[PDB]
Amino acid sequence: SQSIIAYTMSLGAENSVAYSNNSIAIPINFTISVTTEILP
Amino acid sequence: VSMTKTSVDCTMYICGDSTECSNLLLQYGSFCTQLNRALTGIAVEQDKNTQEVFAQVKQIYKTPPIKDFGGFNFSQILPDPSKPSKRSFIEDLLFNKVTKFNGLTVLPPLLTDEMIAQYTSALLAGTITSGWTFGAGAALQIPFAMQMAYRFNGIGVTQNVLYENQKLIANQFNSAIGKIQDSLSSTASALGKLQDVVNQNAQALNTLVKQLSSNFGAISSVLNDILARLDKVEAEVQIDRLITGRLQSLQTYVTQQLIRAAEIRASANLAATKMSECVLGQSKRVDFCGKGYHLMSFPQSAPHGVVFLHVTY
Amino acid sequence: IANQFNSAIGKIQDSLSSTASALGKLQDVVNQNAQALNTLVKQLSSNFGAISSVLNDILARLDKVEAEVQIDRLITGRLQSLQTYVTQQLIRAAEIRASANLAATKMSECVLGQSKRVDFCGKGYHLMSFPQSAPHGVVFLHVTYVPAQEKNFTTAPAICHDGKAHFPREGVFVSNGTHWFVTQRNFYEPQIITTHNTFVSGNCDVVIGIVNNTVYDPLQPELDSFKEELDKYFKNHTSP
Amino acid sequence: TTHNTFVSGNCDVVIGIVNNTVYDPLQPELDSFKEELDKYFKNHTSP
Ligand SMILES: *[C@@H]1O[C@H](CO)[C@@H](O[C@@H]2O[C@H](CO)[C@@H](O[C@H]3O[C@H](CO)[C@@H](O)[C@H](O)[C@@H]3O)[C@H](O)[C@H]2NC(C)=O)[C@H](O)[C@H]1NC(C)=O
Ligand SMILES: *[C@@H]1O[C@H](CO)[C@@H](O[C@@H]2O[C@H](CO)[C@@H](O[C@H]3O[C@H](CO)[C@@H](O)[C@H](O)[C@@H]3O)[C@H](O)[C@H]2NC(C)=O)[C@H](O)[C@H]1NC(C)=O
Ligand SMILES: *[C@@H]1O[C@H](CO)[C@@H](O[C@@H]2O[C@H](CO)[C@@H](O[C@H]3O[C@H](CO)[C@@H](O)[C@H](O)[C@@H]3O)[C@H](O)[C@H]2NC(C)=O)[C@H](O)[C@H]1NC(C)=O
Ligand SMILES: *[C@@H]1O[C@H](CO[C@@H]2O[C@@H](C)[C@@H](O)[C@@H](O)[C@@H]2O)[C@@H](O[C@@H]2O[C@H](CO)[C@@H](O)[C@H](O)[C@H]2NC(C)=O)[C@H](O)[C@H]1NC(C)=O
Ligand SMILES: *[C@@H]1O[C@H](CO)[C@@H](O[C@@H]2O[C@H](CO)[C@@H](O)[C@H](O)[C@H]2NC(C)=O)[C@H](O)[C@H]1NC(C)=O
Ligand SMILES: *[C@@H]1O[C@H](CO)[C@@H](O[C@@H]2O[C@H](CO)[C@@H](O)[C@H](O)[C@H]2NC(C)=O)[C@H](O)[C@H]1NC(C)=O
Ligand SMILES: *[C@@H]1O[C@H](CO)[C@@H](O)[C@H](O)[C@H]1NC(C)=O
Ligand SMILES: *[C@@H]1O[C@H](CO)[C@@H](O)[C@H](O)[C@H]1NC(C)=O
Ligand SMILES: *[C@@H]1O[C@H](CO)[C@@H](O)[C@H](O)[C@H]1NC(C)=O
């Protein structure tokens, strides 16, 4: 049931921001992330 | 940010349709491949460069339908939906301002200019609605005058200086984005660093094609003329001259293109660094985002490049 | 914070163990130098239009004055095969240099410091980084604060109190829709809007979108708590 | 002092917190005024 598909790529998920002249979002919580960056 | 992905059928360049010439080119071993590998390496690196600059968001933000940015008028740098290509008014000025047998081909970029405009739209709508915060994590909305107040506080100017001058600051900003249209409409010369890259790649290909007309001490530069006029054991000595000069003409082109690709890489790394530190943040690095203390920057797509509109106090 | 950090260092081991692809940028450099040498050695087998590529086969078969012409073909092609290799390796060495200068910059600015440069030390706000050696390279484990659970709030640029307009010293004014608080920009910690969390500038006419709410003053109870004591003193001193 | 420091939460959660006083510069500026206030009430016993 497998095959090779071909498609126009999505640049990402779309996500309209909930903007207003008097609305702010603030984080109630955080995540400490650790990420590997590798360099020659 | 990038240059035209160019691939050459070396065997068509050196020995265009002559099977006997191709049998002679095999006496030089790997050089017919080594140069296709090198040109493919350059060509892949243009898609790499273009993604390191523009793909700094994995999520596509949109501007709200209402335009209450506290009086700041982004209409010239946000998209115009009415066009077939969703490009901003300033991006159309930028797009207007930058203008066979031989085996050469031009490959398309992985991202069309419509996808570069869609990434640039997302970076700009992220910047206008959420400040630096979409750089750090999830986008957090903030009113644009409160973002500008945080900006002012970053340059060491107390945030009451924004709110007590907010109509003036917006009129100065709107006037300055006004002059960006006037500069990008009036002169040809403003886009010089992108036109110079387009010109150098066109000049190197003009040279590469002109060397096909050179004799290198053969009795003719036309390959089929040599093979028409001479029998095989004599013709092989004339053809070895054409193969030798042509192959050296390609190694010269590919060396020049590798050295030039390293310069476009260095520029793409600078452009990606400015996307990160000027658009996704506010920089305390002096003179890194134009003269003045950096407030914020807006990215714009250009043919094979990026324009940053830096805003400074 | 320590459990999130310890958990994240746990995921680094799982990632670097599970896929082969993680060191792709280092393996690609080992592969390029292997491929360029495979090519440089393969060109020893090429004729360059001599009667053989084996140098001793030429010199066994032909006398000096003829062999000079065959050997000159091999010398010419071989020498071009080295100039191709050395040019490719010089251009490559400049790319590895540019990466080493970046890695040295990240050692200085991410490990020996803390970076205010956005996205220079991975996604998030940079906390610190740990270097790890790799064959022909470096791994940096960047540690970053990422804001995780956002909630919306109503907000205002200033509080209007006694016709004086008040602004936050640090952070932003926010409301749950009933009360107003001052809080720090990257972590919800609401506080009463005091004269110590805010600063005055000008009057309330000029600021677009200013809001009416109380500003507290800790001197107010710490001096009314002496008013009623002082009044008790006076009332009691009517008793003699 | 209350000027060199800031308050948040209570002393149960902070690993390795230590017991010491924090000074308040309003405390002498109000209690020098309390001993003054006491003298003014005690002088008002003389009429
Ligand atoms: C906005 O934030 C306000 C401050 O946190 C909050 O007001 C506080 O609400 C709680 C109840 O949810 C009150 O707690 C009192 O509840 C009753 C009062 O009769 C008593 O049984 C309790 O002992 C306790 O005193 C707080 O007193 C109240 N604070 C004030 C200053 O009014 C609002 O409820 C929040 N509003 C929203 C929509 O989130
Ligand atoms: C924020 O609080 C302010 C104080 O309550 C309030 O200002 C008040 O606005 C009214 C309406 O104009 C004024 O009432 C006077 O209106 C005219 C003169 O402008 C007179 O003809 C009337 O008789 C009446 O006196 C108040 O004088 C004015 N008070 C002050 C101190 O400015 C704001 O409107 C409030 N804003 C919001 C959004 O709540
Ligand atoms: C820092 O100073 C604190 C205040 O002096 C002190 O806390 C005190 O600890 C003792 C010992 O537990 C408590 O004494 C009571 O303990 C239980 C009830 O909790 C009873 O069985 C005892 O009979 C006695 O009543 C104090 O009540 C407690 N005080 C407070 C305000 O919490 C800390 O222990 C000190 N820490 C250090 C390291 O110096
Ligand atoms: C914070 O609020 C925004 C939008 O405001 C709300 O809009 C209504 C839905 C109602 O809840 C009002 O009381 C609020 O003022 C939220 O944005 C919505 O997000 C959902 C997905 O979670 C999406 O389907 C909606 O289309 C969005 N609506 C708008 C107008 O943008 C946002 O999610 C809220 N944030 C949190 C963490 O709760
Ligand atoms: C912040 O996020 C963390 C997760 O990273 C939350 O921690 C979890 O909390 C639940 C209870 O709500 C526990 O059952 C889990 O075991 C906790 N996980 C860890 C890793 O500690 C934390 O509760 C959140 N804090 C707030 C205030 O929302
Ligand atoms: C934002 O700026 C644009 C450009 O100046 C404004 O659009 C112009 O508006 C005038 C007056 O209606 C027209 O004559 C121009 O032709 C418009 N130009 C364009 C490109 O549309 C726009 O009105 C401003 N927006 C706001 C909300 O003030
Ligand atoms: C916000 O926008 C609405 C219209 O959408 C307007 O009525 C209101 O006055 C604005 N408020 C502020 C604080 O600018
Ligand atoms: C009133 O003052 C007298 C002495 O002046 C004192 O003994 C008494 O406790 C005081 N009572 C009150 C209620 O202040
Ligand atoms: C520090 O470590 C010692 C043991 O080495 C322990 O007794 C002490 O409680 C620790 N103090 C703090 C503040 O963690």
Side-chain angles (χ1 to χ4, degrees), chain A residues 1-5 7-9 11-16 18 20-21 23 26 28-29 31-35 38-39:
Chain A
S1 63
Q2 305 292 358
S3 56
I4 299 173
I5 58 163
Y7 53 91
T8 296
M9 62 188 281
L11 303 192
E14 177 280 336
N15 184 22
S16 183
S20 178
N21 70 20
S23 182
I26 302 189
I28 290 184
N29 204 357
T31 182
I32 303 298
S33 77
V34 184
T35 63
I38 310 100
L39 292 173

PDB file of all heavy atoms in Angstrom, chain A residues 1-5 7-9 11-16 18 20-21 23 26 28-29 31-35 38-39:
ATOM      1  N   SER A   1       0.803  -1.232   0.000  1.00  0.00           N
ATOM      2  CA  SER A   1       0.000   0.000   0.000  1.00  0.00           C
ATOM      3  C   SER A   1       0.838   1.286   0.000  1.00  0.00           C
ATOM      4  O   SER A   1       0.292   2.388  -0.080  1.00  0.00           O
ATOM      5  CB  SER A   1      -0.963  -0.013   1.196  1.00  0.00           C
ATOM      6  OG  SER A   1      -0.260  -0.010   2.430  1.00  0.00           O
ATOM      7  N   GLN A   2       2.163   1.166   0.079  1.00  0.00           N
ATOM      8  CA  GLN A   2       3.101   2.285  -0.026  1.00  0.00           C
ATOM      9  C   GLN A   2       3.314   2.738  -1.476  1.00  0.00           C
ATOM     10  O   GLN A   2       3.186   1.954  -2.420  1.00  0.00           O
ATOM     11  CB  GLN A   2       4.453   1.900   0.579  1.00  0.00           C
ATOM     12  CG  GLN A   2       4.429   1.388   2.026  1.00  0.00           C
ATOM     13  CD  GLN A   2       4.059   2.440   3.068  1.00  0.00           C
ATOM     14  OE1 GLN A   2       3.827   3.607   2.798  1.00  0.00           O
ATOM     15  NE2 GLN A   2       3.993   2.061   4.323  1.00  0.00           N
ATOM     16  N   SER A   3       3.695   3.998  -1.644  1.00  0.00           N
ATOM     17  CA  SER A   3       4.085   4.618  -2.913  1.00  0.00           C
ATOM     18  C   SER A   3       4.911   5.884  -2.658  1.00  0.00           C
ATOM     19  O   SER A   3       4.958   6.385  -1.532  1.00  0.00           O
ATOM     20  CB  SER A   3       2.839   4.962  -3.739  1.00  0.00           C
ATOM     21  OG  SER A   3       1.959   5.795  -3.014  1.00  0.00           O
ATOM     22  N   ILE A   4       5.579   6.409  -3.689  1.00  0.00           N
ATOM     23  CA  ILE A   4       6.214   7.733  -3.628  1.00  0.00           C
ATOM     24  C   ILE A   4       5.178   8.793  -4.005  1.00  0.00           C
ATOM     25  O   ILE A   4       4.683   8.820  -5.131  1.00  0.00           O
ATOM     26  CB  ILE A   4       7.470   7.808  -4.519  1.00  0.00           C
ATOM     27  CG1 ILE A   4       8.520   6.778  -4.054  1.00  0.00           C
ATOM     28  CG2 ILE A   4       8.074   9.221  -4.472  1.00  0.00           C
ATOM     29  CD1 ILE A   4       9.741   6.661  -4.970  1.00  0.00           C
ATOM     30  N   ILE A   5       4.847   9.680  -3.073  1.00  0.00           N
ATOM     31  CA  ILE A   5       4.030  10.871  -3.335  1.00  0.00           C
ATOM     32  C   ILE A   5       4.905  12.049  -3.755  1.00  0.00           C
ATOM     33  O   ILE A   5       6.076  12.110  -3.392  1.00  0.00           O
ATOM     34  CB  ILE A   5       3.165  11.237  -2.114  1.00  0.00           C
ATOM     35  CG1 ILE A   5       3.987  11.497  -0.834  1.00  0.00           C
ATOM     36  CG2 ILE A   5       2.102  10.157  -1.881  1.00  0.00           C
ATOM     37  CD1 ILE A   5       3.200  12.241   0.250  1.00  0.00           C
ATOM     38  N   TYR A   7       4.361  16.542  -3.814  1.00  0.00           N
ATOM     39  CA  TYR A   7       3.472  17.560  -3.244  1.00  0.00           C
ATOM     40  C   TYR A   7       4.144  18.930  -3.178  1.00  0.00           C
ATOM     41  O   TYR A   7       5.363  19.004  -3.073  1.00  0.00           O
ATOM     42  CB  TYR A   7       3.061  17.113  -1.837  1.00  0.00           C
ATOM     43  CG  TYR A   7       4.217  16.763  -0.922  1.00  0.00           C
ATOM     44  CD1 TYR A   7       4.792  17.744  -0.095  1.00  0.00           C
ATOM     45  CD2 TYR A   7       4.732  15.458  -0.913  1.00  0.00           C
ATOM     46  CE1 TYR A   7       5.884  17.425   0.731  1.00  0.00           C
ATOM     47  CE2 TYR A   7       5.830  15.138  -0.097  1.00  0.00           C
ATOM     48  CZ  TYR A   7       6.406  16.118   0.732  1.00  0.00           C
ATOM     49  OH  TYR A   7       7.447  15.798   1.544  1.00  0.00           O
ATOM     50  N   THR A   8       3.368  20.018  -3.171  1.00  0.00           N
ATOM     51  CA  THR A   8       3.904  21.336  -2.790  1.00  0.00           C
ATOM     52  C   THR A   8       4.130  21.372  -1.286  1.00  0.00           C
ATOM     53  O   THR A   8       3.205  21.096  -0.521  1.00  0.00           O
ATOM     54  CB  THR A   8       2.992  22.490  -3.204  1.00  0.00           C
ATOM     55  OG1 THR A   8       2.904  22.551  -4.607  1.00  0.00           O
ATOM     56  CG2 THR A   8       3.532  23.850  -2.770  1.00  0.00           C
ATOM     57  N   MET A   9       5.340  21.691  -0.842  1.00  0.00           N
ATOM     58  CA  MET A   9       5.698  21.655   0.576  1.00  0.00           C
ATOM     59  C   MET A   9       4.948  22.699   1.405  1.00  0.00           C
ATOM     60  O   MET A   9       4.771  23.842   0.984  1.00  0.00           O
ATOM     61  CB  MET A   9       7.214  21.778   0.746  1.00  0.00           C
ATOM     62  CG  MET A   9       7.805  23.092   0.234  1.00  0.00           C
ATOM     63  SD  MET A   9       9.614  23.122   0.243  1.00  0.00           S
ATOM     64  CE  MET A   9       9.905  23.459   1.999  1.00  0.00           C
ATOM     65  N   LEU A  11       5.228  25.295   4.330  1.00  0.00           N
ATOM     66  CA  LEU A  11       6.290  26.037   5.019  1.00  0.00           C
ATOM     67  C   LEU A  11       6.239  25.878   6.543  1.00  0.00           C
ATOM     68  O   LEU A  11       7.242  26.067   7.229  1.00  0.00           O
ATOM     69  CB  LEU A  11       6.214  27.507   4.619  1.00  0.00           C
ATOM     70  CG  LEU A  11       6.316  27.752   3.111  1.00  0.00           C
ATOM     71  CD1 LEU A  11       6.527  29.240   2.893  1.00  0.00           C
ATOM     72  CD2 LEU A  11       7.461  26.983   2.456  1.00  0.00           C
ATOM     73  N   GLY A  12       5.073  25.510   7.057  1.00  0.00           N
ATOM     74  CA  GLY A  12       4.791  25.177   8.445  1.00  0.00           C
ATOM     75  C   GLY A  12       3.290  24.989   8.639  1.00  0.00           C
ATOM     76  O   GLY A  12       2.516  25.110   7.686  1.00  0.00           O
ATOM     77  N   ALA A  13       2.858  24.741   9.870  1.00  0.00           N
ATOM     78  CA  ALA A  13       1.458  24.937  10.227  1.00  0.00           C
ATOM     79  C   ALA A  13       1.128  26.433  10.216  1.00  0.00           C
ATOM     80  O   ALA A  13       1.909  27.240  10.717  1.00  0.00           O
ATOM     81  CB  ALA A  13       1.209  24.332  11.609  1.00  0.00           C
ATOM     82  N   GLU A  14      -0.019  26.830   9.679  1.00  0.00           N
ATOM     83  CA  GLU A  14      -0.517  28.197   9.839  1.00  0.00           C
ATOM     84  C   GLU A  14      -1.021  28.435  11.270  1.00  0.00           C
ATOM     85  O   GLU A  14      -1.556  27.525  11.911  1.00  0.00           O
ATOM     86  CB  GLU A  14      -1.552  28.491   8.746  1.00  0.00           C
ATOM     87  CG  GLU A  14      -2.206  29.879   8.839  1.00  0.00           C
ATOM     88  CD  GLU A  14      -3.345  29.981   9.871  1.00  0.00           C
ATOM     89  OE1 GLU A  14      -3.969  28.955  10.225  1.00  0.00           O
ATOM     90  OE2 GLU A  14      -3.636  31.114  10.318  1.00  0.00           O
ATOM     91  N   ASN A  15      -0.827  29.648  11.796  1.00  0.00           N
ATOM     92  CA  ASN A  15      -1.214  30.013  13.156  1.00  0.00           C
ATOM     93  C   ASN A  15      -1.417  31.527  13.324  1.00  0.00           C
ATOM     94  O   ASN A  15      -0.517  32.233  13.778  1.00  0.00           O
ATOM     95  CB  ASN A  15      -0.142  29.483  14.127  1.00  0.00           C
ATOM     96  CG  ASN A  15      -0.520  29.723  15.574  1.00  0.00           C
ATOM     97  OD1 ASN A  15      -1.679  29.890  15.920  1.00  0.00           O
ATOM     98  ND2 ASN A  15       0.428  29.730  16.481  1.00  0.00           N
ATOM     99  N   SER A  16      -2.596  32.042  12.977  1.00  0.00           N
ATOM    100  CA  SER A  16      -2.979  33.430  13.272  1.00  0.00           C
ATOM    101  C   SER A  16      -2.823  33.760  14.761  1.00  0.00           C
ATOM    102  O   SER A  16      -3.290  33.013  15.624  1.00  0.00           O
ATOM    103  CB  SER A  16      -4.423  33.678  12.833  1.00  0.00           C
ATOM    104  OG  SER A  16      -4.781  35.026  13.058  1.00  0.00           O
ATOM    105  N   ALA A  18      -3.484  35.859  18.245  1.00  0.00           N
ATOM    106  CA  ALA A  18      -4.679  36.448  18.856  1.00  0.00           C
ATOM    107  C   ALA A  18      -4.513  37.930  19.264  1.00  0.00           C
ATOM    108  O   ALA A  18      -4.805  38.310  20.396  1.00  0.00           O
ATOM    109  CB  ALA A  18      -5.111  35.538  20.011  1.00  0.00           C
ATOM    110  N   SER A  20      -4.670  42.025  19.883  1.00  0.00           N
ATOM    111  CA  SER A  20      -5.576  43.141  20.144  1.00  0.00           C
ATOM    112  C   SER A  20      -4.791  44.318  20.727  1.00  0.00           C
ATOM    113  O   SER A  20      -3.723  44.130  21.307  1.00  0.00           O
ATOM    114  CB  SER A  20      -6.683  42.704  21.104  1.00  0.00           C
ATOM    115  OG  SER A  20      -7.542  43.785  21.401  1.00  0.00           O
ATOM    116  N   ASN A  21      -5.342  45.525  20.635  1.00  0.00           N
ATOM    117  CA  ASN A  21      -4.759  46.747  21.182  1.00  0.00           C
ATOM    118  C   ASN A  21      -4.603  46.753  22.715  1.00  0.00           C
ATOM    119  O   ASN A  21      -4.004  47.682  23.252  1.00  0.00           O
ATOM    120  CB  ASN A  21      -5.564  47.953  20.664  1.00  0.00           C
ATOM    121  CG  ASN A  21      -6.980  48.097  21.218  1.00  0.00           C
ATOM    122  OD1 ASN A  21      -7.322  47.554  22.259  1.00  0.00           O
ATOM    123  ND2 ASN A  21      -7.806  48.853  20.517  1.00  0.00           N
ATOM    124  N   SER A  23      -4.522  43.259  24.610  1.00  0.00           N
ATOM    125  CA  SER A  23      -4.349  41.862  25.038  1.00  0.00           C
ATOM    126  C   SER A  23      -2.886  41.455  25.084  1.00  0.00           C
ATOM    127  O   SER A  23      -2.153  41.710  24.131  1.00  0.00           O
ATOM    128  CB  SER A  23      -5.109  40.925  24.107  1.00  0.00           C
ATOM    129  OG  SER A  23      -4.993  39.580  24.531  1.00  0.00           O
ATOM    130  N   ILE A  26       1.091  35.869  28.716  1.00  0.00           N
ATOM    131  CA  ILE A  26       2.224  35.698  29.630  1.00  0.00           C
ATOM    132  C   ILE A  26       2.346  34.223  30.016  1.00  0.00           C
ATOM    133  O   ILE A  26       1.329  33.588  30.297  1.00  0.00           O
ATOM    134  CB  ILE A  26       2.112  36.642  30.844  1.00  0.00           C
ATOM    135  CG1 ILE A  26       2.045  38.101  30.350  1.00  0.00           C
ATOM    136  CG2 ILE A  26       3.293  36.453  31.808  1.00  0.00           C
ATOM    137  CD1 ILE A  26       2.158  39.172  31.432  1.00  0.00           C
ATOM    138  N   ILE A  28       2.647  31.193  32.297  1.00  0.00           N
ATOM    139  CA  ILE A  28       2.449  30.711  33.663  1.00  0.00           C
ATOM    140  C   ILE A  28       3.565  29.746  34.073  1.00  0.00           C
ATOM    141  O   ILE A  28       3.828  29.567  35.259  1.00  0.00           O
ATOM    142  CB  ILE A  28       1.040  30.089  33.757  1.00  0.00           C
ATOM    143  CG1 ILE A  28       0.028  31.251  33.656  1.00  0.00           C
ATOM    144  CG2 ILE A  28       0.821  29.267  35.041  1.00  0.00           C
ATOM    145  CD1 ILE A  28      -1.442  30.858  33.828  1.00  0.00           C
ATOM    146  N   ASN A  29       4.234  29.122  33.107  1.00  0.00           N
ATOM    147  CA  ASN A  29       5.213  28.072  33.330  1.00  0.00           C
ATOM    148  C   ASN A  29       6.286  28.070  32.230  1.00  0.00           C
ATOM    149  O   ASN A  29       6.063  28.605  31.142  1.00  0.00           O
ATOM    150  CB  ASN A  29       4.440  26.746  33.376  1.00  0.00           C
ATOM    151  CG  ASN A  29       5.150  25.654  34.141  1.00  0.00           C
ATOM    152  OD1 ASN A  29       6.270  25.814  34.614  1.00  0.00           O
ATOM    153  ND2 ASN A  29       4.408  24.577  34.322  1.00  0.00           N
ATOM    154  N   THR A  31       9.739  25.626  30.281  1.00  0.00           N
ATOM    155  CA  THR A  31      10.468  24.380  30.075  1.00  0.00           C
ATOM    156  C   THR A  31      11.937  24.691  29.855  1.00  0.00           C
ATOM    157  O   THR A  31      12.286  25.478  28.981  1.00  0.00           O
ATOM    158  CB  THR A  31       9.822  23.521  28.978  1.00  0.00           C
ATOM    159  OG1 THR A  31      10.522  22.308  28.836  1.00  0.00           O
ATOM    160  CG2 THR A  31       9.757  24.135  27.586  1.00  0.00           C
ATOM    161  N   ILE A  32      12.808  24.091  30.658  1.00  0.00           N
ATOM    162  CA  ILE A  32      14.247  24.102  30.417  1.00  0.00           C
ATOM    163  C   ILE A  32      14.529  23.110  29.297  1.00  0.00           C
ATOM    164  O   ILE A  32      14.391  21.904  29.497  1.00  0.00           O
ATOM    165  CB  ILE A  32      15.030  23.733  31.686  1.00  0.00           C
ATOM    166  CG1 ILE A  32      14.710  24.659  32.870  1.00  0.00           C
ATOM    167  CG2 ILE A  32      16.540  23.704  31.410  1.00  0.00           C
ATOM    168  CD1 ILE A  32      15.061  26.133  32.670  1.00  0.00           C
ATOM    169  N   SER A  33      14.892  23.590  28.113  1.00  0.00           N
ATOM    170  CA  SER A  33      15.269  22.727  26.992  1.00  0.00           C
ATOM    171  C   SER A  33      16.780  22.578  26.911  1.00  0.00           C
ATOM    172  O   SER A  33      17.505  23.548  27.134  1.00  0.00           O
ATOM    173  CB  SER A  33      14.695  23.232  25.675  1.00  0.00           C
ATOM    174  OG  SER A  33      15.397  24.323  25.152  1.00  0.00           O
ATOM    175  N   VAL A  34      17.263  21.382  26.578  1.00  0.00           N
ATOM    176  CA  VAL A  34      18.667  21.182  26.235  1.00  0.00           C
ATOM    177  C   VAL A  34      18.751  20.690  24.806  1.00  0.00           C
ATOM    178  O   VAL A  34      18.155  19.669  24.479  1.00  0.00           O
ATOM    179  CB  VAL A  34      19.397  20.260  27.213  1.00  0.00           C
ATOM    180  CG1 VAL A  34      20.879  20.169  26.846  1.00  0.00           C
ATOM    181  CG2 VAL A  34      19.310  20.787  28.645  1.00  0.00           C
ATOM    182  N   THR A  35      19.479  21.396  23.951  1.00  0.00           N
ATOM    183  CA  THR A  35      19.592  21.077  22.524  1.00  0.00           C
ATOM    184  C   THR A  35      21.044  20.936  22.119  1.00  0.00           C
ATOM    185  O   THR A  35      21.865  21.777  22.477  1.00  0.00           O
ATOM    186  CB  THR A  35      18.958  22.155  21.650  1.00  0.00           C
ATOM    187  OG1 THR A  35      19.650  23.365  21.834  1.00  0.00           O
ATOM    188  CG2 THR A  35      17.483  22.397  21.951  1.00  0.00           C
ATOM    189  N   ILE A  38      26.033  20.995  16.726  1.00  0.00           N
ATOM    190  CA  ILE A  38      27.245  20.272  16.338  1.00  0.00           C
ATOM    191  C   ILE A  38      28.007  21.082  15.300  1.00  0.00           C
ATOM    192  O   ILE A  38      27.416  21.481  14.300  1.00  0.00           O
ATOM    193  CB  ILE A  38      26.891  18.872  15.802  1.00  0.00           C
ATOM    194  CG1 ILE A  38      25.953  18.069  16.732  1.00  0.00           C
ATOM    195  CG2 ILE A  38      28.186  18.081  15.588  1.00  0.00           C
ATOM    196  CD1 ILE A  38      24.488  18.107  16.291  1.00  0.00           C
ATOM    197  N   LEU A  39      29.304  21.313  15.489  1.00  0.00           N
ATOM    198  CA  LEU A  39      30.129  22.077  14.555  1.00  0.00           C
ATOM    199  C   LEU A  39      31.402  21.315  14.173  1.00  0.00           C
ATOM    200  O   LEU A  39      32.109  20.831  15.059  1.00  0.00           O
ATOM    201  CB  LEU A  39      30.479  23.442  15.165  1.00  0.00           C
ATOM    202  CG  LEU A  39      29.282  24.386  15.325  1.00  0.00           C
ATOM    203  CD1 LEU A  39      29.702  25.632  16.087  1.00  0.00           C
ATOM    204  CD2 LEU A  39      28.736  24.846  13.975  1.00  0.00           C
TER     205      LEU A  39
END
